[PDB]
Design a protein around this ligand. Structure first.
Ligand SMILES: Nc1noc2ccc(C(F)(F)F)cc12
Lengths: 274, 274
């Protein structure tokens, strides 16, 4: 139907047409006495990945300390010590494609060497353009998220599309094939609560760019802003964003609560004729 | 905006524009040794109504044995003994409008005398046309649900709209004012699982009739058909139907899980600009 290619992920292949793809969020739980690779640290990660797999995740998204939600000031040297053991163990023990959640070229490169299949970049190849070359080099899919260092829009959606296209250009100029490009509206980033809702409301506009769209709204602050609920009480809110996202044509959803969101995605898929 | 009238419910008034209205389902839990009105029976009902009120319900829908989901063969004499004490106590103790879930004229009449504000008719005034006269008489809103004794459609949606209009005509010919008419697509009734999904997918078509729409998909079988989950494990599925319903412009949702569905409705409302 809509997509005449599959998303190629090394040993794994993701069909973009038959169902909404669920990307499970795995954040590192660092050990306080080591720089990475410890049993408890990695075993925690591996167990969470198996769990999310058993609950219906199609992709495991792995993030070190430098990325969301903590945004630690940490070197690539430090960061690699931490994320590489996780990617090695998860890729070995869990048979799903792995995305590396980083905006750093060198981390992306070593993550892929370690076994990751997809690059997920919260800065859309703008913070470190060479990440697009890494991606082109290894021929992996790259997720380009909308982001910017400010909330001074003239027109939110038009600007979002312009910004994303600037990301696409960096990517293609490095050699990234169209079929390896995925976009993300960057909900919860560089947007007021009202702009996040407005982005949700007009999400279907991203579709004119001709690339698969991943939605990542899970547990985010704007949901708290609407419901006045803390992060642990945001299942219902996340769900609403997921269903609306799917209705507006998104191919992936990046979520913490895989069990619940997979059920909801599956029901949405059935209703919209996916 | 969309509605230039409020829904008038005696002492209560429901705004159709500012938020999706939540209708909480209260089914009778009959005592086995009495025909109605017992303390345990009514106290159970009253407690469930307060609970649903505290959880964000805007309307309490009360059903006796003859209606869904049990469809008991019971006389109006018997049925009144059962539903009247519930309406009396709930209306007294819970300050929300009450809908009576019946297709029987005489039950509707006495329910309204007892304190109910809205008639909810699963047969769309077709089983007992005089229910429309009761409604006109007392000047209460009536919910006309799509239903039929068969699943032999030529074209599902066109037929649904035709059938609903046949209901509208009965209602208006009895004297029911347009502002007192609400429609319901009758999901889960007289439809295959596939037709229920198709009705969900094309729900926005009901809007051309110019009347508020109530959606009632809660825990229904087709959700089980899609997810392969039993009735207690259908929160996520119900939610998906609720969000899609709201996106397609429905004014009410009739649900069992008020807490969860209110949160989800509230988030949807915020995103679509309601
Ligand atoms: N299966 C559940 N247990 O607790 C829940 C809270 C919300 C939801 C929702 F709304 F996301 F479906 C599902 C569940």
């Amino acid at each position: 139907m809509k997509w005449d290619y599959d998303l190629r992920c090394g040993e794994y292949t993701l069909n973009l047409n038959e169902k909404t793809l669920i990307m499970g969020i795995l954040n590192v739980t660092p050990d306080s006495f080591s720089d990475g690779g410890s049993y408890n640290e990695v075993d925690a990660a591996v167990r969470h990945a198996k769990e999310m797999r058993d609950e219906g995740a199609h992709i495991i998204d792995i993030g070190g300390e430098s990325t969301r939600p903590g945004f630690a000031k940490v070197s690539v040297e430090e960061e690699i010590k931490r994320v590489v053991p996780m990617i090695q163990a998860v890729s070995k023990e869990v048979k799903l494609p792995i995305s590396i959640d980083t905006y750093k070229a060198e981390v992306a490169k070593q993550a892929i060497e370690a076994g990751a299949h997809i690059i997920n970049d919260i800065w859309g190849a703008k913070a470190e353009p060479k990440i697009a070359e890494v991606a082109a080099h290894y021929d992996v899919p790259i997720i380009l998220m909308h982001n910017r260092d400010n909330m001074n829009y003239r027109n939110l959606m038009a600007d979002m599309i312009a910004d994303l296209y600037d990301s696409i250009k960096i990517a293609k100029d490095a050699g990234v094939r169209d079929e390896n490009i995925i976009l993300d509206p960057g909900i919860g980033f560089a947007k007021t609560p009202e702009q996040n809702l407005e982005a949700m409301r007009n999400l279907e506009q991203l579709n004119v760019l001709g690339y698969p769209v991943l939605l990542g709204t899970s547990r985010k602050s704007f949901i708290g802003h609407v419901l006045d609920l803390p992060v642990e009480e945001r299942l219902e809110g996340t769900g609403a964003t997921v269903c609306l996202g799917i209705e507006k044509g998104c191919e992936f959803v990046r979520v913490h609560d895989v069990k619940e969101m997979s059920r909801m995605a599956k029901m949405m898929d059935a209703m919209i004729g996916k």
